[PDB]
Amino acid sequence: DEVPGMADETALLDWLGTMREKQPVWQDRYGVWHVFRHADVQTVLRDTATFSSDPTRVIEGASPTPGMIHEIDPPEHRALRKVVSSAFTPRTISDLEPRIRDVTRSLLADAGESFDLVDVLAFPLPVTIVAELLGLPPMDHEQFGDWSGALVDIQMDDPTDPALAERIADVLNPLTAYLKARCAERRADPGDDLISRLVLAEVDGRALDDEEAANFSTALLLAGHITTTVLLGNIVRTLDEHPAHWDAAAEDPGRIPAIVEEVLRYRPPFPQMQRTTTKATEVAGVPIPADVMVNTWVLSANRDSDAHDDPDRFDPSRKSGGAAQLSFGHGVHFCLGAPLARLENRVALEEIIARFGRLTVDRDDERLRHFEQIVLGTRHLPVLAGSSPRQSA
Ligand SMILES: CC[C@H]1OC(=O)[C@H](C)[C@@H](O[C@H]2C[C@@](C)(O)[C@@H](O)[C@H](C)O2)[C@H](C)[C@@H](O[C@@H]2O[C@H](C)C[C@H](N(C)C)[C@H]2O)[C@](C)(O)C[C@@H](C)C(=O)[C@H](C)[C@@H](O)[C@H]1C
Ligand code: HEM
C-alpha cells in the first residue's frame, strides 16, 4: 500500500500520475477512498448531500465539533458562513492592501542579503494580518505558530482513528481555551474585529454558544495563516525553478496575480481534503459504501491532463483562476479567505521584486526541509538576495 509522504514531491507526483492512469478511485488499507481525477474531485466536492464534510460520521464514538464551519453541511452551513462572509468581500479585503504592504515592506527592509523567507516574511505577514482580523495582539503571534506547528506535525496514520481525533482535540485545547477567553472579552467590549462580529451574531435565532464561537474562532485563525505562509514559500521556490518569470514579473508586475494562480495550481498548499459518504454511492463507476471516508487529491486533479494541457509545465498564461481555482476548494466550502490570500501573496511578491529584483533559493542550506504531512511546502526557505539596496560601491 503506502501513499508516498508529502516531503518527496517528485515521488508523490509520480505516484499520483500512475493512480490517475490505473486506479483513479482507490481504497487504502484503512478503508479510506482516494479520488485522483479532476472531474471526479469536482463531482465529489459539488455533491454535499452524498459527500459530507463532517468526519465524525466515520470516527467510532466521535460527536461533531460544534461551530466547525469546514465540517458542517447544508442547510446548517449557509447560516454559519453568513456570520463572517461580509468580512471577506473583495471591496472590504481591498482596504487591507496598504496595511499588508506596510507590514511586508518593513519586514523585508530588515532582512540581510541571506535570509529564511519563512521566518522573515512568509510566517509573520499572514499571522499579523489574521491576528489583526481577529483583534488579537502581536505578543501572541509566537503561540500561534507553535500551536499550528504542533497540529501540522501531529502523529497521524489512519485518519479515521478516534485516537487521532482525541489527539487533535488535545493539541488545540490551549488555542481554543485562549480564543474562548477572547470571545468572552468581545461580548463585554466589542470592536470592529471578526471575533466581535461572531460573538454578537444570530445563527438560527440564537447567538453561538461559548463552545461554538470558540471553535469557530479556532478554525478562522488556523485557516487564516498556515496555507498563506505555505503558498508564499511555494511561489518563490517555484519562481526559483522557472526563473525567467522573475524578469517577466519585474517588467510587467500585472503578471503577478496570474503567477499566484498558477503556483496555487502547481503546488496547492493543502493537497488533499476529506469527505464522508452519507449513503452507498459511486465515483466514475466505482462502488463506494455508506459511512466511509473519501480523500480528494486536489494536487492530483491540478496535474490531470484531462483538465490542464501539459499539466506539469509551470505556465502563468493558463486561463484558470477565480472560482475555478481548485486549490481553494470547490462549491459551497470554497475558501472564504481567497481574496485575502491572493492579495497578501500579490503584495508579497511585488515587494520582493521591488526590493530584491529576485531571490535565489539556497538549495543546499540545511534548513530547507519539506513538511512531511498535511501541507505541501517547506518549513524554511533559505534565500539569497539577487540584488538589494544594501549593496555598496
Ligand atoms: C476553516 C478552513 C480550514 O480548516 C481548518 O484549519 C480546520 C480547523 C482543521 O481541522 C482540524 C481540527 C478539527 C477538530 O476540526 C478536526 O476534526 C480536523 C480533522 O482537523 C483542518 C481541516 C486541518 O487539517 C486536518 O488536520 C488533521 C490533523 C489531519 C487531517 N487529514 C490529513 C486527515 C487534516 O485535513 C489543518 C491542519 O488545519 C489543515 C490546514 C493546514 C489547511 O491547509 C486547510 C486549507 C485549512 O486551513 C482549512 C480546511
Ligand atoms: C493560499 C492560502 C489559502 C489556501 C490554499 C486555502 C485553502 C482552502 C481550502 C482548500 C478550503 C476548503 C476546505 C474544504 O473544502 O474542506 C478553505 C476553506 C476556508 N478558508 Fe481558506 N485557504 C487559504 C487562505 C485563507 C485565509 C487567509 C483565510 C482567512 C481566515 C481562509 C479562510 C477559510 C475559511 C473560513 C474556510 C472554510 C470555508 C467554509 O467551509 O465555508 N483561508 N481554504
From Swiss-Prot:
Heme binds at H77, R81, R275, H333, C335. Substrate binds at H70, E71, Q274. Binds 1 heme b (iron(II)-protoporphyrin IX) group per subunit. Its EC number is 1.14.13.154. Pfam families: p450. Residues 303-322 are annotated as: Disordered. Pathway: Antibiotic biosynthesis; erythromycin biosynthesis. Keywords: Antibiotic biosynthesis, Heme, Iron, Metal-binding, Monooxygenase, NADP, Oxidoreductase. It catalyses: erythromycin D + NADPH + O2 + H(+) = erythromycin C + NADP(+) + H2O. The keyword Iron applies. GO terms for biological process: macrolide biosynthetic process. Residues 303-318 have a biased composition (Basic and acidic residues). Disruption phenotype: Cells lacking this gene no longer produce erythromycin A but accumulate the B and D forms of the antibiotic. SUPFAM superfamilies: Cytochrome P450 (SSF48264). It comes from the Bacteria. GO terms for molecular function: heme binding; iron ion binding; monooxygenase activity; NADP binding; oxidoreductase activity, acting on paired donors, with incorporation or reduction of molecular oxygen, NAD(P)H as one donor, and incorporation of one atom of oxygen. Its cofactor is heme b. Monomer. Belongs to the cytochrome P450 family. This is Erythromycin C-12 hydroxylase. It comes from Saccharopolyspora erythraea (strain ATCC 11635 / DSM 40517 / JCM 4748 / NBRC 13426 / NCIMB 8594 / NRRL 2338).
